[PDB]
Amino acid sequence: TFGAGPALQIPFPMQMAYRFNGIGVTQNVLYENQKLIANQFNSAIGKIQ
Amino acid sequence: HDGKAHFPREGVFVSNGTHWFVTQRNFYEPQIITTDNTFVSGNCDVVIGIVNNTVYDPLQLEL
Ligand SMILES: *[C@@H]1O[C@H](CO)[C@@H](O[C@@H]2O[C@H](CO)[C@@H](O)[C@H](O)[C@H]2NC(C)=O)[C@H](O)[C@H]1NC(C)=O
Ligand SMILES: *[C@@H]1O[C@H](CO)[C@@H](O[C@@H]2O[C@H](CO)[C@@H](O)[C@H](O)[C@H]2NC(C)=O)[C@H](O)[C@H]1NC(C)=O
Numbered sequence: 176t177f178g179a180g181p182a183l184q185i186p187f188p189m190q191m192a193y194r195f196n197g198i199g200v201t202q203n204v205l206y207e208n209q210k211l212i213a214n215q216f217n218s219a220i221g222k223i224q
Numbered sequence: 225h226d227g228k229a230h231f232p233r234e235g236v237f238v239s240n241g242t243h244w245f246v247t248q249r250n251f252y253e254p255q256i257i258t259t260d261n262t263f264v265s266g267n268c269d270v271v272i273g274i275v276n277n278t279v280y281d282p283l284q285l286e287l
């Protein structure tokens with residue numbers, strides 16, 4: 176939202192549900208796997224270093 | 225509502241302090257939460273941040 180006008184706040188877990196709906200996956204996939212997805216992101220970030 | 229978790233078909237759930245609505249994301253047009261605005265997926269014990277509220281059923285309100 177901040178690249179197209181004012182910066183409108185939004186919780187990050189709800190932001191990712193927007194981005195899951197953008198790839199054709201429903202948003203109940205994220206909320207019901209939120210802890211797994213959080214752990215996959217943290218592990219994938221730590222492997223970059 | 226009634227042990228089931230309801231997610232919006234398209235939009236967000238918002239509250240004006242007291243009441244809960246479902247609106248589109250890019251423009252504030254609040255609407256009453258019905259079974260046509262939302263879809264059910266699973267139970268309430270798995271989503272982090274779920275809130276109790278009333279989801280109105282158009283069919284059960286007539287039959
Ligand atoms: C989807 O894949 C993930 C990642 O491999 C699976 O989560 C792992 O599950 C195993 C046990 O099967 C655990 O030992 C790992 O710690 C889990 N990984 C993480 C990052 O939490 C998950 O089970 C799979 N989902 C399925 C098969 O339904
Ligand atoms: C949140 O929105 C609801 C729905 O529009 C408001 O409820 C109405 O409030 C007005 C003004 O107080 C009353 O005249 C109406 O009778 C109320 N309608 C119903 C169905 O109760 C509510 O006041 C709003 N809350 C806040 C804090 O602004």
Ligand SMILES: *[C@@H]1O[C@H](CO)[C@@H](O)[C@H](O)[C@H]1NC(C)=O
Nearest residue numbers: 225226227268274275276277
């Ligand atoms: C309302 O929500 C709480 C958690 O905030 C839950 O423990 C409780 O069972 C819910 N009550 C009803 C009537 O569903």
